[PDB]
Structure 1
Amino acid sequence: MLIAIEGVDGAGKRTLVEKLSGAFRAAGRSVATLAFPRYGQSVAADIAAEALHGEHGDLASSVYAMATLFALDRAGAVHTIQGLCRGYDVVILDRYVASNAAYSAARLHENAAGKAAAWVQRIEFARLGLPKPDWQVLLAVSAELAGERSRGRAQRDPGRARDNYERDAELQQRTGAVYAELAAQGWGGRWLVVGADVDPGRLAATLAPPD
């Protein structure tokens, strides 16, 4: 079973990955986890990170160029995703294809029914052959909490160096709304929308009901 955890930066995605991992293992299921982008393991992801911190000229301002880099990074991980799914009962991804649909649409002021989200689905699922997740779990938290926890688009920089607090906060709002539309329409498969305090045992039971 392949599960993707989705949401805006600062939602607490990794915390959920860990507690869900613990709940599955308590129920006798083996679990492996993987986070995107895969820094150090593709040129594409490293260039994207550098672009977010101001390198590479006008690269980051092209929404489709950044999205292409994140897709190429995932394409490089297909054998890992498939190998983990062979060796483990449950594979949990921190961010996956829907991240690309949500942020790209939001950067372009589009909704989930728009061109960017359709382009993401075509290029990643159809053209590059990424496996579809069995579940996509949207971790939806308050805009305020996400704003305080997010490190912004330049996540290497110390907090004292953030100066785009407004652009990033507006983008996160739009991205949250696209995510919600993605979940409502079953984009790429089944979705569940959960909060920060979701019980891990009961969440694991819902995602993989016992036989």
Structure 2
Amino acid sequence: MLIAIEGVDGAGKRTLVEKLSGAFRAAGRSVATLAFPRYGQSVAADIAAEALHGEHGDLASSVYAMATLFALDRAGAVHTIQGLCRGYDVVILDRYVASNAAYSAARLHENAAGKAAAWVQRIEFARLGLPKPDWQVLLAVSAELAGERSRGRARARDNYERDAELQQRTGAVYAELAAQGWGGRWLVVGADVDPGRLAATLA
């Protein structure tokens, strides 16, 4: 059971993942969680983070270069994810493939029907062989509240987080992805969602 948690920056994903893990375990299911990008476990991830903070020359200026590094990070995580799914009943991922599609489209002012979304789909699911998630849960939230959360919980904000319009468009692209079942079945929830009920719903 592979579950992916998606959403904009400051949406509260970490928290949702926490509550959901407990609920699942409460219902006796073994849970494992993994977050992307894998800071500290991937050079591709680390360079991506440093790039979002202005480092590495013109790296961050390329939408596809950034998407590639995140995709390369997940690719190096294929055996890790398969290993988790084998050792636990529920594997929960804080951010996954859909993140790349939502942000890349948003940075290019494209929607779910744009080239970037389709490109991410082919690259990660078809070529890099990333395991399709059984569930993609979009934690939808107020753009203002999310923006403020990042501002408060800030370590300094990167170039994506300081881009209020990028965040709004990313929220919108996410909604389109969820509505059309991009990459599988989605579940849209709010911050005030009941863990136990959500868990019972997903599993």
| Length-normalised TM-score, structure 1 | 0.92
Using the TM superposition, give the Cα deviation of residue 146 of structure 1 relative to its aligned residue in structure 2, in angstroms.
Answer: 0.3
Task: Evaluate the alpha carbon distance shift between residue 162 and residue 27 of structure 1 in structure 2; reply closer, same or farther with a 3 A threshold.
Answer: closer
Task: Evaluate the alpha carbon distance shift between residue 36 and residue 162 of structure 1 in structure 2; reply closer, same or farther with a 3 A threshold.
Answer: closer
Task: Evaluate the alpha carbon distance shift between residue 161 and residue 94 of structure 1 in structure 2; reply closer, same or farther with a 3 A threshold.
Answer: closer
State whether residues 53 and 159 of structure 2, in contact with CA within 8 Å, keep that contact through their aligned partners in structure 1. no
State whether residues 9 and 150 of structure 1, in contact with CA within 8 Å, keep that contact through their aligned partners in structure 2. yes
- CA distance, structure 2, for counterparts of residue 80 and residue 41 of structure 1: 11
| 1:72 and 2:69 correspond | no
Task: Evaluate the alpha carbon distance shift between residue 86 and residue 110 of structure 1 in structure 2; reply closer, same or farther with a 3 A threshold.
Answer: same
Using the TM superposition, give the Cα deviation of residue 150 of structure 1 relative to its aligned residue in structure 2, in angstroms.
Answer: 1.7
Using the TM superposition, give the Cα deviation of residue 5 of structure 1 relative to its aligned residue in structure 2, in angstroms.
Answer: 0.3
Secondary structure at the residue paired with 1:179? Answer: helix
Per-residue Cα deviation, 1:129-165 (whole angstroms, up to 9, x for no partner): 00000000000011111010125999xxxxx976979
Task: Evaluate the alpha carbon distance shift between residue 153 and residue 197 of structure 1 in structure 2; reply closer, same or farther with a 3 A threshold.
Answer: closer
Using the TM superposition, give the Cα deviation of residue 47 of structure 1 relative to its aligned residue in structure 2, in angstroms.
Answer: 0.9
Task: Evaluate the alpha carbon distance shift between residue 99 and residue 153 of structure 1 in structure 2; reply closer, same or farther with a 3 A threshold.
Answer: farther
Per-residue Cα deviation, 1:32-51 (whole angstroms, up to 9, x for no partner): 00000011212111111111
State whether residues 84 and 91 of structure 1, in contact with CA within 8 Å, keep that contact through their aligned partners in structure 2. yes
- CA distance, structure 2, for counterparts of residue 27 and residue 161 of structure 1: 38
| Length-normalised TM-score, structure 2 | 0.95
Per-residue Cα deviation, 1:79-104 (whole angstroms, up to 9, x for no partner): 01000000100000000000000000
Using the TM superposition, give the Cα deviation of residue 196 of structure 1 relative to its aligned residue in structure 2, in angstroms.
Answer: 0.4
State whether residues 59 and 66 of structure 2, in contact with CA within 8 Å, keep that contact through their aligned partners in structure 1. yes
- CA distance, structure 1, for counterparts of residue 176 and residue 94 of structure 2: 20
Using the TM superposition, give the Cα deviation of residue 183 of structure 1 relative to its aligned residue in structure 2, in angstroms.
Answer: 0.1
State whether residues 153 and 168 of structure 1, in contact with CA within 8 Å, keep that contact through their aligned partners in structure 2. no
Task: Evaluate the alpha carbon distance shift between residue 162 and residue 189 of structure 1 in structure 2; reply closer, same or farther with a 3 A threshold.
Answer: closer
- CA distance, structure 2, for counterparts of residue 165 and residue 66 of structure 1: 11
- CA distance, structure 2, for counterparts of residue 128 and residue 199 of structure 1: 35
- CA distance, structure 1, for counterparts of residue 56 and residue 184 of structure 2: 35
Identity of aligned residues (%): 100
Residue matched to 1:84: 84
State whether residues 152 and 168 of structure 1, in contact with CA within 8 Å, keep that contact through their aligned partners in structure 2. no
- CA distance, structure 1, for counterparts of residue 89 and residue 160 of structure 2: 41
State whether residues 152 and 162 of structure 1, in contact with CA within 8 Å, keep that contact through their aligned partners in structure 2. no
Q: Which moved more, 1:48-57 or 1:5-14?
A: 48-57
- CA distance, structure 2, for counterparts of residue 125 and residue 185 of structure 1: 17
Secondary structure at the residue paired with 1:5? Answer: strand
- CA distance, structure 2, for counterparts of residue 97 and residue 112 of structure 1: 14
- CA distance, structure 1, for counterparts of residue 153 and residue 103 of structure 2: 11
Task: Evaluate the alpha carbon distance shift between residue 163 and residue 79 of structure 1 in structure 2; reply closer, same or farther with a 3 A threshold.
Answer: closer
Q: Give unpaired runs (5+ residues) of structure 1.
A: 155-159
Using the TM superposition, give the Cα deviation of residue 54 of structure 1 relative to its aligned residue in structure 2, in angstroms.
Answer: 1.0
State whether residues 2 and 85 of structure 1, in contact with CA within 8 Å, keep that contact through their aligned partners in structure 2. yes
- CA distance, structure 2, for counterparts of residue 137 and residue 65 of structure 1: 26
Using the TM superposition, give the Cα deviation of residue 118 of structure 1 relative to its aligned residue in structure 2, in angstroms.
Answer: 0.4
Q: Give unpaired runs (5+ residues) of structure 2.
A: none
* Number of aligned positions between the proteins: 203
RMSD: 2.2
